[PDB]
Design an enzyme around this catalytic site. Sequence first.
Site, short mmCIF file in Angstrom:
data_model
loop_
_atom_site.label_atom_id
_atom_site.label_comp_id
_atom_site.label_asym_id
_atom_site.label_seq_id
_atom_site.Cartn_x
_atom_site.Cartn_y
_atom_site.Cartn_z
CB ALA A 24 38.86 39.04 24.37
N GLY A 28 43.44 41.58 28.48
CA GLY A 28 43.24 40.15 28.64
C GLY A 28 41.82 39.70 28.42
CD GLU A 29 41.61 35.61 25.83
OE1 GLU A 29 41.91 34.61 26.51
OE2 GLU A 29 41.77 35.65 24.59
CB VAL A 30 36.47 37.82 31.59
CG1 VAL A 30 35.63 37.19 32.73
CG2 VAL A 30 37.24 39.01 32.14
CE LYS A 44 40.46 41.33 36.15
NZ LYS A 44 39.89 42.71 36.25
CG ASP A 135 34.89 51.77 37.39
OD1 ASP A 135 34.12 52.44 36.68
OD2 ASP A 135 35.70 50.96 36.89
C1 LIG Z 1 26.31 36.98 27.94
O1 LIG Z 1 27.67 36.88 28.35
C2 LIG Z 1 28.02 37.00 29.68
C3 LIG Z 1 28.78 38.09 30.10
C4 LIG Z 1 29.13 38.21 31.44
C5 LIG Z 1 28.73 37.24 32.37
N1 LIG Z 1 29.07 37.35 33.68
C6 LIG Z 1 30.24 37.93 34.04
N2 LIG Z 1 30.83 38.93 33.34
N3 LIG Z 1 32.02 39.18 34.08
C7 LIG Z 1 32.92 40.11 33.73
N4 LIG Z 1 32.72 40.88 32.63
C8 LIG Z 1 32.68 42.33 32.71
C9 LIG Z 1 31.43 42.82 33.44
C10 LIG Z 1 31.37 44.34 33.40
C11 LIG Z 1 31.84 43.62 34.66
C12 LIG Z 1 34.05 40.26 34.53
C13 LIG Z 1 34.23 39.46 35.66
C14 LIG Z 1 35.47 39.63 36.50
N5 LIG Z 1 33.31 38.52 35.98
C15 LIG Z 1 32.23 38.42 35.17
C16 LIG Z 1 31.05 37.53 35.20
C17 LIG Z 1 30.81 36.50 36.24
N6 LIG Z 1 31.36 36.65 37.44
O2 LIG Z 1 30.09 35.56 35.97
C18 LIG Z 1 27.97 36.14 31.94
C19 LIG Z 1 27.63 36.02 30.60
#
Ligand SMILES: COc1ccc(Nc2nn3c(NCC4CC4)cc(C)nc3c2C(N)=O)cc1
EC number: 2.7.10.2
Length: 273
Positions: A24, A28-30, A44, A135
């Site tokens: 978060a 917003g949130e993911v 998202k 980025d």
């Molecule tokens: C331990 O917590 C977690 C944390 C993240 C994930 N995986 C993911 N993290 N994440 C995001 N977080 C930000 C990251 C910097 C880009 C954004 C989006 C659009 N998809 C994902 C996944 C995804 N596509 O699965 C899985 C477990």
Amino acid sequence: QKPWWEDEWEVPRETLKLVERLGAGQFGEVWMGYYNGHTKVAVKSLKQGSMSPDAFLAEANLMKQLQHQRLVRLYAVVTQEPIYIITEYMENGSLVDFLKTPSGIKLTINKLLDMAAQIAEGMAFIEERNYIHRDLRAANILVSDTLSCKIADFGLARLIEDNEYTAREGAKFPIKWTAPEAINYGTFTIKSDVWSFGILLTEIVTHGRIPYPGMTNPEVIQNLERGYRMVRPDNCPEELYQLMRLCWKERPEDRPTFDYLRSVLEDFFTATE
Ligand SMILES: COc1ccc(Nc2nn3c(NCC4CC4)cc(C)nc3c2C(N)=O)cc1
């Protein structure tokens, strides 16, 4: 675009179930969730009023133009408030985090080189299509359950008309990851991404450590202007370090293509087993 009632990416909000919140933030949130019961997806969501919804959806629109195995794939959008962008779920999260888990720590140099090549491969497609990312950094690479890597976060990605995108002079970008011309003039090209690729290579071999160890931003700028580049990371094969140096050449046009980086890294990979 096509309006939402003819857009093949629009799905009814009901087809989605948000299960676990992964993050978060201000905008917003993911979440991890499921589409139609069975299909694992990342969702998202836009915090109403935090930012333009046209600004939020422009990320999805660009992803309709950049479809490739090596790029995180747009799955769908819900274009009514709250606005969702739904994407390919990546089970091992971001590269920067994964490299620190017990599974990440035990990877050989062979496998890290393999991953580096997969990223260059995805960037070669972006290059070929006349886009730039802006980025590129281990935080914006995601890792699948099979330990494959994909480029993500296209919020800043831009299609080039004339080799060059020029940001506003109010625009700030991360100093350690961004090529000098982009920091100094706001001018970005695929060669600015190449420079970022070099920095990203350091995060790979250090298992996610911050670039330019023990240096502030003003120290990094000053050093670069003297002709110094990042100090040899601990345990970095000298071949890889020289490849980094190519990404960091003074003139943008002297920096290699992503296709060259890809072929070089595959050679490094096939020769370490
Ligand atoms: C331990 O917590 C977690 C944390 C993240 C994930 N995986 C993911 N993290 N994440 C995001 N977080 C930000 C990251 C910097 C880009 C954004 C989006 C659009 N998809 C994902 C996944 C995804 N596509 O699965 C899985 C477990």
